[PDB]
Design an enzyme around this catalytic site. Structure first.
Site, PDB file in Angstrom:
ATOM      1  N   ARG A  81       0.854  -1.176   0.000  1.00 29.81           N
ATOM      2  CA  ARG A  81       0.000   0.000   0.000  1.00 29.81           C
ATOM      3  C   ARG A  81       0.895   1.233   0.000  1.00 29.81           C
ATOM      4  NH1 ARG A  81      -2.945   2.786   4.724  1.00 29.81           N
ATOM      5  NH2 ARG A  81      -3.972   4.488   3.558  1.00 29.81           N
ATOM      6  N   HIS A 125      -3.154  11.293   0.792  1.00 26.35           N
ATOM      7  CA  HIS A 125      -2.621  11.012   2.118  1.00 26.35           C
ATOM      8  C   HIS A 125      -2.075  12.303   2.699  1.00 26.35           C
ATOM      9  CE1 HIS A 125      -0.916   8.547   5.322  1.00 26.35           C
ATOM     10  NE2 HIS A 125      -1.316   7.449   4.704  1.00 26.35           N
ATOM     11  N   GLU A 171      -7.870   8.523   6.327  1.00 24.95           N
ATOM     12  CA  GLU A 171      -8.216   9.145   7.619  1.00 24.95           C
ATOM     13  C   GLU A 171      -8.793  10.576   7.538  1.00 24.95           C
ATOM     14  OE1 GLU A 171      -4.679   8.731  10.107  1.00 24.95           O
ATOM     15  OE2 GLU A 171      -4.988   6.582  10.333  1.00 24.95           O
ATOM     16  N   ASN A 308      -7.556   1.724   9.605  1.00 28.68           N
ATOM     17  CA  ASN A 308      -6.328   1.923  10.357  1.00 28.68           C
ATOM     18  C   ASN A 308      -6.604   1.728  11.847  1.00 28.68           C
ATOM     19  OD1 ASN A 308      -5.287   2.533   7.843  1.00 28.68           O
ATOM     20  ND2 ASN A 308      -5.010   4.726   8.265  1.00 28.68           N
ATOM     21  N   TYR A 310      -5.021   0.984  15.697  1.00 24.78           N
ATOM     22  CA  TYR A 310      -3.811   1.096  16.517  1.00 24.78           C
ATOM     23  C   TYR A 310      -4.030   0.818  17.986  1.00 24.78           C
ATOM     24  CZ  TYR A 310      -1.098   3.076  12.677  1.00 24.78           C
ATOM     25  OH  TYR A 310      -0.428   3.276  11.493  1.00 24.78           O
ATOM     26  N   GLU A 381      -3.651  -0.316   8.073  1.00 24.32           N
ATOM     27  CA  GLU A 381      -2.503   0.095   8.909  1.00 24.32           C
ATOM     28  C   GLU A 381      -2.627  -0.519  10.288  1.00 24.32           C
ATOM     29  OE1 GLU A 381      -1.740   4.319   9.505  1.00 24.32           O
ATOM     30  OE2 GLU A 381      -1.949   4.688   7.339  1.00 24.32           O
TER      31      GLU A 381
END
Ligand code: ZN
Length: 471
Positions: A81, A125, A171, A308, A310, A381
């Site tokens: 990616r 991005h 995001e 994503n 985390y 991610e």
């Protein structure tokens, strides 16, 4: 070491890759014809980034991409990616094409396919061409839908015969939050901010324009390119898990409000064709309304959902109050808590916000499965950082990162084995890179980058992946 994990432990044809973004790895920020993005201007302002660092050189992937591709292939990944820099293609964001920039992505894409690595390509991005910010006011302007669609059209035309997996944005919540609520990322807008702004209204305007721009670009893909090219287009959303501090009605409600203001803000439009009901109720006329036609364009406009993932937070509730609006953040009416029963939710990585909470990965994936009709999800991610100033050897012995990936992937596997439609998983990052506000003080890579010499050295976590992923 592997903890029972291997390709056999995941569905057949499950995709494993690594991730970078253009500004964070490419370098050649002001070379090869590239025009500046909003992050070039931001990073070059003294005091904005740690050590006054910027992405001028970054990892210099621009010149080293064949090395980096050879490396990812040797580590047994299926996919990569990466993002296309809008201002490397269109230095002014519109009009004139930079053919040298086009040639770069052609070369990268061709080498990837030569080496059996699938390109997963992000169009955006965080790197809005500076020209578009100055002329149109960036994501505040509804004209972004046309401007982004024309950009996306060019990329579909030029690369789409080879690229079959697209993402539009990365995001949009963080752009809204940090660019327009807190004013800590470009364009540094907020109620009290020197650049101007309004933390109660602008985050919502920005998000709406991301959603409308996504829908317009996808409509263009489907009507003009899809029949010949037969690819797919999704969107990347951040989702950190929220867990009720207790089982009280009020804490459970708070945890759910946070989910809705975080992920529902985008997923309810994309899946169900409307904003979350709680956001409608609380934000009211500060939340833009999709017309029926716009909602029908937005609904079903993502072929898969990039997540994503985390970390996780405990959430504490309160009685819902009538309040003078101040910001998107304050609209949630929740209280963040990082301990329950005298224990922290998890230890922290180098980044203060990043609590190592492997069960948050199950939380997020299970929640999307149960609430949104089990859409196709890609974990776009997942990763953790080391601090600045370590020796090479210390960077390489990243045993905490090894444990991080074993644990998080075990929790993902749990959710998949329960029936979650997860198609792939991508480690942030292939390389230590430019970590935005932290500059080069934060190291997310499975491969170490010596930022003096630019040499690459795989860490233990890279070898862990190589072992886990062998065919
Ligand atoms: Zn170079």
């Amino acid at each position: 070491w592997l903890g029972g994990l291997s390709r056999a432990a995941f569905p057949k044809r499950f995709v494993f890759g690594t991730v970078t973004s253009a500004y964070q790895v490419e370098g050649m920020a002001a070379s090869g014809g590239r025009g500046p993005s909003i992050w070039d201007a931001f990073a070059h302002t003294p005091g904005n980034v740690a050590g006054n660092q910027n992405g001028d050189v970054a990892t210099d992937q621009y010149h080293r991409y064949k090395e980096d591709v050879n490396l990812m292939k040797s580590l047994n990944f299926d996919a990569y990616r990466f993002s296309i820099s809008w201002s490397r293609i269109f230095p002014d964001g519109e009009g004139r094409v930079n053919q040298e920039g086009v040639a770069y992505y052609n070369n990268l894409i061709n080498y990837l396919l030569q080496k059996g690595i699938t390109p997963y390509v992000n169009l955006y991005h965080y790197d809005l061409p500076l020209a578009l910010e100055k002329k149109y006011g960036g994501w505040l302007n509804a004209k972004m839908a046309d401007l982004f669609t024309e950009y996306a059209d060019f990329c579909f035309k030029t690369f789409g015969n080879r690229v079959k997996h697209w993402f539009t944005f990365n995001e949009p919540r963080i752009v809204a939050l940090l660019g327009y609520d807190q004013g800590t990322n470009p364009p540094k807008r907020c109620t009290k901010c020197a650049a101007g702004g309004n933390s109660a209204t602008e985050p919502y305007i920005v998000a709406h324009n991301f959603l409308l721009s996504h829908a317009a670009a996808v409509a263009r893909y489907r009507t003009k390119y899809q029949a010949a090219q037969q690819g797919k287009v999704g969107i990347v959303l951040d989702f950190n898990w929220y867990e009720a501090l207790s089982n009280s009605t009020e804490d459970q409600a708070a945890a759910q409000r946070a989910r809705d203001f975080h992920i529902g803000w985008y997923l309810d439009p994309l899946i169900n064709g409307h904003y979350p009901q709680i956001m409608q109720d609380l934000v009211k006329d500060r939340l833009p309304k999709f017309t029926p036609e716009q909602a029908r364009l937005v609904k079903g406009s993502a072929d898969y959902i990039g997540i994503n993932q985390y970390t996780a937070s405990y959430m504490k509730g309160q009685q819902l109050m009538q309040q003078t609006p101040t910001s998107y953040s304050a609209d949630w009416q929740v209280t963040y808590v990082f301990a329950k029963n005298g224990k922290p939710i998890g230890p922290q990585a180098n980044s203060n916000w990043l609590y190592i909470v492997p069960w948050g990965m199950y939380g997020c994936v299970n929640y999307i499965k149960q609430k949104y009709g089990n859409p196709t999800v890609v974990i776009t991610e997942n990763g953790m950082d080391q601090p600045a100033n370590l020796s090479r050897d210390q960077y390489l012995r990243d045993t905490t990162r090894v444990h991080f990936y074993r644990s998080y992937l075990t929790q993902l596997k749990k959710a998949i084995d329960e029936g979650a439609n997860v198609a792939g998983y991508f480690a942030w990052s292939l390389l230590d890179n430019f970590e935005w506000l932290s500059g080069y003080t934060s190291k997310f890579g499975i491969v170490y980058v010596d930022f003096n010499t630019l040499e690459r050295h795989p860490k233990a976590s890279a070898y862990w992946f190589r072992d886990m992923l062998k065919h």
